[PDB]
A paper describes a structure:
The regulation of extracellular proteolysis is critical to blood hemostasis and innate immunity and proteases plasma prekallikrein (PK), and coagulation factors XII (FXII) and XI (FXI) act as master regulators of several cascades including coagulation, fibrinolysis, complement activation, and inflammation 1, 2, 3, 4. PK and FXI are homologous and share 58% amino acid sequence identity with the unique feature of four tandem repeats of 90 amino acid apple domains at the N‐terminus, which harbor exosites for substrates, cofactors, and receptors 18. Factor XI is a disulfide‐linked dimer whereas PK is a monomer 20, 21. Factor XIIa recognizes and cleaves both PK and FXI but it is unknown which of the apple domains is critical for these interactions or the molecular basis of the reciprocal cleavage of the FXII zymogen by PKa.
PKa crystallized in the presence of inhibitor benzamidine and the structure was determined to 1.3 Å resolution. The PKa protease structure consists of two β‐barrels and the benzamidine inhibitor is observed bound in the active site S1 pocket with the Ile372 residue from the activation loop forming the characteristic electrostatic interaction with Asp558. The full‐length structure defines the interactions formed between the PKa protease domain and the apple domains whereby two extended loops “latch” on to the apple domains with specific interactions shown in Fig. 1C. Residues 476 to 484 form a latch loop1 and residues 566 to 570 comprise latch loop2. Latch loop2 adopts an extended β‐hairpin and on its tip residue Lys566 forms a salt bridge to Asp95 from the apple 2 domain and Gly569 in latch loop2 forms a hydrogen bond to Gln26 from the apple 1 domain topside α‐helix. An alternate conformation occurs in the apple 4 domain where an internal Cys321‐Cys326 disulfide distinguishes PK as a monomer precluding formation of the extensive disulfide‐linked dimer interface observed in FXI 19. A comparison of the full‐length structures of PKa with the FXI zymogen revealed a large unexpected conformational 180° rotational rearrangement of the intact apple domain disc relative to the protease domain. The PKa latch loop1 is a key pivot point for this relative rotation as it contains the Cys364‐Cys484 disulfide which anchors the protease domain to the apple domains after cleavage of the Arg371‐Ile373 peptide bond in the activation loop.
Author numbering: 1 to 358, 363 to 365, 372 to 487, 494 to 610
């Protein structure tokens, strides 16, 4: 299943399938996730190895048992792919690396005022995969304040150096943040030419397009259909690029279908899996396993659960079948595509769903941006007027976690509208879709006007589909990088904020919080956060929203915004419901309702 655990001071021996340079272990893990054979990775930070060639080395590995020998190596980081991890699978990597130079082809150089502006330029340039920003103090005077846009084979830097006054990062195309947008155009009976970066067999042009989208050096493609009379031409998916970034020519050709990478689409990218089953076709590859199963959908499930399976063929031949079960051939190849696509077969083929990514275990702030906090929701009541009252956190397709006190005046579910995948409240019109409540589950021990057990589950009438802008937060099973978000007041006697706000706040021990609030019992089921001087806090209209902390590269929901004495006062921390202490309640209530 999903294995997010990391191994400190550890390096796996052998099983090597690919290597590259990455700025950190999380980016290496992402490459492992998307690589067709990687199950395990090991990463060397520059401090961990003298050998210049091995610093920032990312080593992608496979094993027929899913396990490898490992050695102690100070500073090395090892882990698993995130295959089988559902919505945790994403190619979005927002991190900026200060004091790091990521080398490649420096195809475009311009002046900018910040590393964030350089990143936006990279995101909105079709050829840019990664960038470096040379600050005012960069040693080469002729690069000071310049943004260098870059590409490389495979989209990984050709070298990574520790270097002062350089700040590097990746394009945010895979965060669905491009402003250029994307061409959904499919051209029938039309071929492209240019530079072929890969050649694979696909059952249709749509699989070809998704493979192009996630291939670092694909910008557009041409598919040759199974109608070709020339056998060696059939089902060929050519992944392509051009020195310019756009096709330099087009050629009319029967039984050819062309299109573009969808990596520059806004809000939502195609899912990085091919979920259709194809009747009458056989997908050739190396045999992993054969078992009898009850129908082709179970065969798909079997392939998905066997993490090395890439694709399968379910046989409908009588010699391969019993009364209600037939042979399911689990297969793989070097690149995740079949080695042969044969039609006129008695059987049905498809792919593993292991990478399909569709529960998991403000005062003094600044404006958020798209996809930063994709679990944040707005809880609103419509009577005659409509107004935002509370936040919430998406924790599954049909579940939001919030504060019980949001419902004190209106526990009736019928007047509530829940907005998700929204940054600015001004964007909501009478046309904007919203979720409706099917069930409110207020904690059994919560009492109106009292602070204990301030936690409620909301079951939506319809599931939400995940996008880069709308997806869940993982729940916990110490923290130093915690953030609170919402549209609440920006002053104690303040107003609702149009743009979702964020603020970074340190956690405070219960001991300390209890000293600040001598009139209330601060329990082990509460968590507190704030500054001695105040000035940064949640406020009215933020309640029920998230307190999230990023630990070992992973966001998790640590608190639910609950109360404070006023907002952002000196020596008066915010108090949050401590989600870890309600995990038994969350799992029981969601399993019992479901
Ligand atoms: Cl598809
Ligand atoms: Na697809």
């Amino acid at each position: 299943g999903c294995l997010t655990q990391l191994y400190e001071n550890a390096f796996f021996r052998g099983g090597d399938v690919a290597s590259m340079y990455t700025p950190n272990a999380q980016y290496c893990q992402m490459r492992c996730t998307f690589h067709p054979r990687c199950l395990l990775f090991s990463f060397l930070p520059a401090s961990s190895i003298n050998d210049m060639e091995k610093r920032f080395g990312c080593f992608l590995k496979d094993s027929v048992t899913g396990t490898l020998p490992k050695v102690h190596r100070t500073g090395a980081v090892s882990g698993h792919s995130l295959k089988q991890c559902g919505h945790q699978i994403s190619a979005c990597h927002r991190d900026i690396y200060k004091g790091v130079d990521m080398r490649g082809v420096n195809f475009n150089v311009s002046k900018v005022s910040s590393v964030e502006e350089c990143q936006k330029r990279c995101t909105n340039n079709i050829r840019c995969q990664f960038f470096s920003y040379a600050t005012q103090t960069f040693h080469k005077a002729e690069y000071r304040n310049n943004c260098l846009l870059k590409y490389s084979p495979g989209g990984t830097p050709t070298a990574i150096k520790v270097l002062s006054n350089v700040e590097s990062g990746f394009s945010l195309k895979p965060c669905a943040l491009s402003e250029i947008g994307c061409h959904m155009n499919i051209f029938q009976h039309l071929a492209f030419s240019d530079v072929d970066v890969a050649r694979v067999l696909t059952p249709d042009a749509f699989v070809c397009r998704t493979i192009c989208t996630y291939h670092p050096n694909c910008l557009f493609f041409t598919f040759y259909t199974n109608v070709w009379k020339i056998e060696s031409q059939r089902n060929v998916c050519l992944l392509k690029t051009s020195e310019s970034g756009t096709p330099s020519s087009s050629t009319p050709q029967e039984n050819t279908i062309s299109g573009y990478s969808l990596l520059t689409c806004k809000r939502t990218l195609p899912e990085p899996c091919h979920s259709k089953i194809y009747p009458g076709v056989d997908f050739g590859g190396e045999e992993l396993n054969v078992t009898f199963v009850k129908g082709v959908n179970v065969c798909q499930e079997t392939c998905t659960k066997m993490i090395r399976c890439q694709f399968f063929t379910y046989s409908l031949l009588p010699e391969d079948c019993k009364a209600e079960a037939c042979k399911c051939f689990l297969r793989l190849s070097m690149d995740g595509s079949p080695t042969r696509i044969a039609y006129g077969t008695q059987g049905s083929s498809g792919y593993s769903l292991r990478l399909c990514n569709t529960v998991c275990t403000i005062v003094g702030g600044t404006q958020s941006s798209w996809g930063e906090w994709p679990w944040q929701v707005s809880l609103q009541v419509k009577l005659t007027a409509q107004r935002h009252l509370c936040g919430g956190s998406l924790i599954g397709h049909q579940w939001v976690l919030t504060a019980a006190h949001c419902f004190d005046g209106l526990p009736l579910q019928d007047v509530w509208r829940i907005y998700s995948g929204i940054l600015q409240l001004s964007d909501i019109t009478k046309d904007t879709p919203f979720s409706q409540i099917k069930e409110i589950i207020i904690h059994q021990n919560y009492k109106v006007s009292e602070g204990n057990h301030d936690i409620a589950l909301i079951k939506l009438q319809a599931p939400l589909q995940y996008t880069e802008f709308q997806k869940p937060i993982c729940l916990p099973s110490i923290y130093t990088n915690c953030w609170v978000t919402g549209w609440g007041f920006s002053a104690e006697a303040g107003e609702i904020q149009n743009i979702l706000q964020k603020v970074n706040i340190p956690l405070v021990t219960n001991e300390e919080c209890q000293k600040r609030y001598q009139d209330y019992k601060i329990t082990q089921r509460m968590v507190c956060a704030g500054y001695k001087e105040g000035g940064k806090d949640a406020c009215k209209g933020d309640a029920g929203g998230p307190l999230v902390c990023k630990h070992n590269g992973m966001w998790r929901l640590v608190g639910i915004t609950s109360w404070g004495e006023g907002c952002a006062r000196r020596e008066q921390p915010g108090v949050y419901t401590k989600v870890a202490e309600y995990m038994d309640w969350i799992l029981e209530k969601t399993q019992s309702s479901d």
